[PDB]
Amino acid sequence: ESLALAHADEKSLGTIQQCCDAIDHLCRIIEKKHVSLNKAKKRRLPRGFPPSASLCLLDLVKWLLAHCGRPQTECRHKSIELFYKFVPLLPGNRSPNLWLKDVLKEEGVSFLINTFEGGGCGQPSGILAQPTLLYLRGPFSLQATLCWLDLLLAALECYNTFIGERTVGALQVLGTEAQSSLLKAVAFFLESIAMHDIIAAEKCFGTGAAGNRTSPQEGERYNYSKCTVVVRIMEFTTTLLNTSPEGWKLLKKDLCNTHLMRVLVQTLCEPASIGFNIGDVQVMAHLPDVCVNLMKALKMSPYKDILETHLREKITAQSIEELCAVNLYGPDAQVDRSRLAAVVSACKQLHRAGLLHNILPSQSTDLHHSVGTELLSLVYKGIAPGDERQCLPSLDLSCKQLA
Amino acid sequence: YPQAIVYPFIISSESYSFKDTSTGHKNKEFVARIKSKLDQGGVIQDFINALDQLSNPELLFKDWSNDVRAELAKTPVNKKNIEKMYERMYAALGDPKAPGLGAFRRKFIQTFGKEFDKHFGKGGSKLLRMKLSDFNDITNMLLLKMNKDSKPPGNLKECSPWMSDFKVEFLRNELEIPGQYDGRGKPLPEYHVRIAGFDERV
């Protein structure tokens, strides 16, 4: 609970680190003494636990599983960590898959759905209480709007962690058995909130009926949380496609695959249009890797045609030809240089996934790639003075990098 | 700003009246709407009850000796206005189980509820029925209450479970420390310090 309380802190203090080390020390203490803690003795009752006479380790792992859907990030990560590390130390030696089978069997899938979508524990909340940001009430503030995004992040994290490790089948856990609200929240965020700004998050004169203002740092604070969810959506889609051979039917429940391709190809061409802020290498380094993994997941699925179709307008063999030589090597017009760099970076990312030929295929069929030849010729002749004006082009750090 | 209005509104709404004209009905409807927009959440009433559980549970009875003694005598018209008195006590002293109830008030209830029930019984009818100097039994009740308090309650867990196990979670349980809207020379940010917890020692 202290780790959960340290959510609204800064990484420079060290509270997260020290609390994590304390939790690992405790974890080692139970891991070295589980056979004595398994028997139901009479022990002190921790805060938040229901009243009882005897405490077992099974009650602790049930508490961890119930609190696995915590909106706080580090506490939820540690909750899943303790859950997976403590399930084997039960009276049996069953894997978490078999344990969740019988626990799911005793209480149906709805127990797991309420655990994942409950937004914590106790009172019903989370995306099940508020699937969209239209369910909220009161004057809209920058503090309140991020809570929905945190709840969506928590739900995505628990679902991804419990699906990717072969713990519960995707069809069993998010099929048509009962209400899920996860696909609805994902579709609402991808279509209505993604590829937008905070002015679209505040809708347009809703029930608040107040224009108010918006601080410059409020935009960045909203954009960080906004860009955090699209990434987790990409790993969620990748995990579903890679784990479930029949997962395309469940992916059809997204109802916004066109919008998913929209955000994917917009993250390709220019990530900063969505809201991805420059300045930190850590956030932007993970983006090409998850994009390539998502591409390789979609390519081995019955979604290749729609991905390719949505991709061609964004990257076209004629657009690169018409943009690659427009007043190049000049002291001005840096926007053309930036656009060419973005296009070539998108082409590299397409080559990483193995779709470069399909997006930009050969048009000459003479054992020599059409686009690559022209790019070579452009680079080899762009360093020449050209004609007979006796002017040798100069190259700077950016021009050499783009060449 | 729904707090600097909500505290004086709760103070004022205890004693209201309304006429039978159209303007009175309009005022009643407007007060109803204001209460509807002001009573949302329920955190304020929980805070009020939790703070009321810290009250000494015999002094509240001692002020009873200050209140119904005003009824005793005079009263050419006794009236039925004392019907809210018994509800006010039984919602705070006579109920064996009330929201926010701690162990101290529970012990006081378990040790005096049957006592004053057999002392008067159905106090609404009996109090208006009998009007004489028989009310000297308040001393008999109050001496026992004064020697029954014994130690102070001490920590918050024995006083009020709500204050001891208060916890601020997302999108609900929003509470602000009272006395921050000065209302002078400037508008207020609403950054205003909010309540996060209570120290366990009283």
UniProtKB/Swiss-Prot annotation, chain B:
The organism's superkingdom is given as Eukaryota
N6-acetyllysine: modified positions:
97, 114, 118
Q: According to its UniProt record, how is this protein modified after translation?
A: Autophosphorylated at two clusters, the T2609 cluster and the S2056 cluster. Autophosphorylation induces a conformational change that leads to remodeling of the DNA-PK complex, requisite for efficient end processing and DNA repair. S-nitrosylated by GAPDH.
Compartment(s) of residence:
Nucleus; Nucleus, Nucleolus; Cytoplasm, Cytosol
- Indicate the family of this protein: Belongs to the PI3/PI4-kinase family.
The record describes the protein's role as: Serine/threonine-protein kinase that acts as a molecular sensor for DNA damage. Involved in DNA non-homologous end joining (NHEJ) required for double-strand break (DSB) repair and V(D)J recombination. Must be bound to DNA to express its catalytic properties. Promotes processing of hairpin DNA structures in V(D)J recombination by activation of the hairpin endonuclease artemis (DCLRE1C). Recruited by XRCC5 and XRCC6 to DNA ends and is required to (1) protect and align broken ends of DNA, thereby preventing their degradation, (2) and sequester the DSB for repair by NHEJ.
Its quaternary organisation is: DNA-PK is a heterotrimer of PRKDC and the Ku dimer (composed of XRCC6/Ku70 and XRCC5/Ku86). Formation of this complex may be promoted by interaction with ILF3. Component of the core long-range non-homologous end joining (NHEJ) complex (also named DNA-PK complex) composed of PRKDC, LIG4, XRCC4, XRCC6/Ku70, XRCC5/Ku86 and NHEJ1/XLF. Additional component of the NHEJ complex includes PAXX. Following autophosphorylation, PRKDC dissociates from DNA. Interacts with DNA-PKcs-interacting protein (KIP) with the region upstream the kinase domain.
Q: Which disease is it linked to?
A: Immunodeficiency 26 with or without neurologic abnormalities: A form of severe combined immunodeficiency characterized by reduced or absent T and B cells, recurrent candidiasis, and lower respiratory tract infections. Some patients show dysmorphic features, severe growth failure, microcephaly, seizures, and impaired neurological functions.
- Name this polypeptide is given: DNA-dependent protein kinase catalytic subunit
Q: What organism, scientifically named, is this protein from?
A: Homo sapiens
Gene for this protein? PRKDC
Full-sequence portion shown in this chain: 3525 to 3726 of 4128
